[PDB]
């Protein structure tokens, strides 16, 4: 079994620093790139920073660059987000979460901890939910719809749009509530060892579809897309998938 654990999560006050580390077993740690992902609470995924198989190149959104500091420690089996001057706004849920090299999909993801930046004087400074998609000069994801009614056995199609070409380097993730995101298609349709193969995906370019051939009633969940072409890596803003 691959193995993700991640440590560290807890109330912290803004402008103070935590430490979060992800043990690794189960795989050849220095063999792969390494993402940390967030949650903000009843909100979608947003990508934070990634480091390559040797920690030589890191990479960082830019709402955390200078405050967050990646780094791996390939003899212990251990991967680190430093985070220094936190903010009301970094509140979320942190997932680690590895890197394959080929196609760029985060194919084992942790279970995740959750980091609470709070004085107490409300939860306005959170700002909400942030602007899902990609921001500044990220390749945009639009997903669609946002939300939609169905029920068992019927045929659902999911979409999503990116700004630029991305090949097929584009991923598909089941969220149910309150559990980690899954991989379901890399490569924009491949499908990821164990998934039933009621899912499909297919598109290059900048058009993807996923597909499930006959809604079953745990598919109720909320989906991802996911660009895996370049850094900040992108996600979707998420269909939910609900019954009617």
């Known amino acids: 079994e691959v193995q993700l654990l991640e440590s560290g999560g807890g109330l912290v006050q803004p402008g103070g620093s935590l430490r979060l580390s992800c043990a690794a077993s189960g795989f050849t740690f220095s063999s792969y790139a390494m993402s940390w992902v967030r949650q903000a609470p009843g909100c979608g995924l947003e990508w934070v920073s990634a480091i390559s198989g040797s920690g030589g190149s890191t990479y960082y959104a830019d709402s955390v660059k200078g405050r967050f500091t990646i780094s791996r420690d390939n003899s212990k089996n251990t991967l680190y987000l430093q985070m220094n001057s936190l903010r009301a706004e970094d509140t979320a849920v942190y997932y680690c979460?590895?890197?394959?090299?080929?196609?760029?999909?985060?194919?084992?993801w942790g279970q995740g901890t959750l980091v609470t930046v709070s004085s107490g004087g409300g939860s306005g400074g959170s700002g909400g939910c942030p602007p899902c998609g990609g921001s500044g000069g990220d390749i945009q994801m639009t997903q669609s719809p946002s939300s939609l009614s169905a029920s068992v056995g019927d045929r659902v199609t999911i979409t999503c749009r990116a700004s630029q070409s991305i090949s097929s380097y584009l991923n598909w993730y089941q969220q149910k509530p309150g559990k980690a995101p899954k991989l379901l298609i890399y490569?924009?349709?491949s499908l990821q060892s164990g998934v039933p193969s009621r899912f499909s995906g297919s598109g290059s370019g900048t058009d993807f579809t996923l597909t499930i051939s006959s809604l079953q009633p745990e598919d109720f969940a909320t989906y991802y897309c996911?660009?895996?072409?370049?850094?900040?890596?992108?996600f979707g803003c998420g269909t939910k998938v609900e019954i009617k």
């Open positions: 490569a924009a349709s």
């Open positions: 979460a590895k890197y394959d090299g080929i196609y760029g999909e985060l194919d084992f």
């Open positions: 996911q660009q895996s072409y370049s850094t900040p890596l992108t």
